[PDB]
Amino acid sequence: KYLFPKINETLLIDIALGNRFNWLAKEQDFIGQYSEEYVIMDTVPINMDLS
Amino acid sequence: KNEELMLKRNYPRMATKLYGNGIVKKQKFTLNNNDTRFNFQTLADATNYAL
């Protein structure tokens, strides 16, 4: 009735967790604020008339 | 039938189809050296645009 209680294990469940969007993660430079993005609109070939 | 049927000619008939010409097709693009350069903060971006 007079001994201090004895613990013997202390375990630390530890799991590493992934992303499933990590191949998308490009590494930019982080200077400047805004980023722009654009295309070229379509422009169909037209008929030649020599008149 | 009478025997002068041998001397009558039966020419082979046929079916043609006359087509004609096609279409010369045309498109152009004008790239500016004055006001396109007020955009495109890198010369590499301007050459990428021109390409």
TrEMBL record, chain A:
Domain of life from the UniProt record: Viruses
UniProt protein name: Major head protein
Organism, as annotated: Staphylococcus phage P68
Whole-protein residues included: 52 to 102 of 408
